[PDB]
Design a protein around this ligand. Sequence first.
Ligand SMILES: [Cl-]
Length: 127
Amino acid sequence: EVITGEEAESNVLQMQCKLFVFDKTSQSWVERGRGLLRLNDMASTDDGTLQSRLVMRTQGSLRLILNTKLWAQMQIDKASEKSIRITAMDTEDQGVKVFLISASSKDTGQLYAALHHRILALRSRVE
Ligand SMILES: [Cl-]
């Protein structure tokens, strides 16, 4: 029931993409970087999936540019065949921001489904 941070990692997918974050000051998209985006299912000692995370490091420097858990109230939409818009928690404890993930048509489709289905599943987690 508790996330310890030492959960085992099950990589659901890895995809080349560009990450943009919405700048509330300029009302525009700002590129944060490009590289491999990873969706991970984190396993408990009971093989339960305590949470899922989207993690991304920009290529070259490998600086962390996205590291967010998925949550039930998360807002996601397929903005286009090649882009996904999501609300996510930002990297240095900074709050909820709106992101744009840009990738190939095929990766976008698979990613949207993977995230959407996980969000729905999280909503079923009422006791
Ligand atoms: Cl988070």
